[PDB]
Amino acid sequence: DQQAEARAFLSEEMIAEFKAAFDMFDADGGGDISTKELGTVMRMLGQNPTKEELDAIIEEVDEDGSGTIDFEEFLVMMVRQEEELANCFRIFDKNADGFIDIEELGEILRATGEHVIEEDIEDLMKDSDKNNDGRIDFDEFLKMM
């Protein structure tokens, strides 16, 4: 189900570009990625992840229950990857209305304890508002973050 949909999402032209990043993780070879091969690719950049930690990273990807990472698993993973900003976007609007208000952000900035000035906070919103509506929406939130 997921594969039959993520597959139609990217045609062979897109899949080709995705294959470039797939071959990097496939430093040892084979047509699929594994937990051991993952840690090897992480250290290639300079990161030192844990084996058991990386094993859990694949467990989440194994929705059906494969064990290792496959090429189509890598494609569906890219297919399911703005939710990140959507979560932060909602965290800013404590009222849950759809947009962030200046009054909502005011306390959020002061809540940190830092000594910020309202002249700086107010001017920041006036400069970030390209259309000048008063509140911040998910549209402007994209360039905002």
Q: How far apart are CA 100 and CA 90, in angstroms?
A: 8
Rounded Cα–Cα distance for residues 56 and 26 (Å): 19
Return binding residues for Ca(2+): 26, 28, 32, 37, 62, 64, 66, 68, 73, 93, 95, 97, 104, 129, 131, 133, 135, 140
Task: Name beta bridge partners: 100.
Answer: 136
d(CA 109, CA 123): 14
Phi, psi of 130 (to 5 degrees): -70, -40
Question: Tokens 């030192």 belong to which residue?
Answer: 48
Tokens of 24: 């990097």
> Which pair of structure tokens corresponds to residue 71?
């090429």
Of 67, 7, 4, the closest CA to residue 37 belongs to 67
- The strand pairing partners of 34, in sequence order, are none
Alpha carbons 131 and 125: distance in angstroms, whole number? 11
Which residues belong to the annotated binding site? 26, 28, 32, 37, 62, 64, 66, 68, 73, 93, 95, 97, 104, 129, 131, 133, 135, 140
Domains by residue range for the chain, with CATH? 1-75 (1.10.238.10), 76-144 (1.10.238.10)
The secondary structure of the chain as a DSSP string is --HHHHHHHS-HHHHHHHHHHHHHHTSS-SSSB-HHHHHHHHHHHT----HHHHHHHHHHH-SSS-SSB-HHHHHHHHHT--HHHHHHHHHH-TT-SSSB-HHHHHHHHHHT-S---HHHHHHHHHHH-SS--SSB-HHHHHHH-
What are the C-alpha distances in Å from 71 to residues 5, 22, 62, 145? 15, 7, 12, 31
Nearest to 70 by CA among 23, 27, 31, 19: 31
